[PDB]
Design a binder for this molecule. Structure first.
Ligand code: SAM
Length: 197
């Protein structure tokens, strides 16, 4: 289940695999929001295939509409938007990504990261290949380096290598409206848990 314009269509494992073969790397942005972060990402890295996942199709309408245009007028070919929720990822995404990403999640995806939820998180790891990079940027440090958290994450397939506390400046490289509200909002701490699956 993917987004063509503001339309919902069907993509097979078949067609996905072809599209993918034309790119050196595949990247998943779970909880992608409005596609702006991905769009920026895709425009600069034409050798990475990008997949954004979000169950809320309406926030993607504008960019989904934009990526579908001609390349002369804003179109892109390295971007697909999947409409699925973290608690039921499509089978066609197993063992597919070189790097997975969960940026600024909220509601339940925030909790699945923070708690963490071993079962759901494990499905996210399942979307990843051999030694695929990962990245988790939450925001509301010592909690993330705890042993209970680090080992709750291993258990799911997520091996922590680095854990930085970040600030507003870091968030300026992102394009979503949400990320801008936070970048130029009040001073705040953003947390980044990166590593290999
Ligand atoms: C703050 S917006 C994310 C913004 C985008 N990731 C960014 O960094 O700008 C929160 C997003 O998380 C998504 N979300 C919350 N729970 C989710 C879940 N369980 N599975 C997938 N997406 C989820 C919502 O759909 C929403 O689009």
């Amino acid at each position: 289940l993917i987004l063509k314009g503001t339309k919902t269509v069907d993509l097979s494992k078949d067609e996905l695999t072809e599209i993918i073969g034309q790119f050196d790397r595949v990247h998943i942005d779970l909880g992608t929001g409005d596609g702006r972060n991905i769009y920026k990402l895709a425009i600069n890295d034409q050798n990475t295939f990008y997949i954004g996942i979000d169950p809320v199709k309406e926030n993607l309408f504008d960019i989904s509409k934009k990526i579908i245009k001609k390349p002369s007028k804003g179109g892109l070919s390295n971007v697909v938007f999947v409409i699925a929720a973290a608690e039921s990822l499509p089978f066609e995404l197993k063992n597919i990504a070189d790097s997975i990403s969960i940026l600024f999640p909220w509601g339940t995806l925030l909790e699945y990261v923070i708690k963490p939820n071993r079962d759901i998180l494990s499905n996210v790891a399942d979307l990843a290949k051999k030694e695929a990079h990962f990245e988790f940027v939450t925001t509301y440090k010592a909690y993330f380096l705890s042993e209970q958290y680090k080992a709750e994450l291993s258990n799911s397939g997520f091996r922590i290598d680095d854990v930085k506390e970040l600030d507003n400046e870091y968030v300026k490289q992102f394009n979503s409206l949400w990320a801008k509200r936070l970048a130029f909002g009040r001073k705040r701490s953003f947390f980044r848990v990166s590593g290999h699956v």
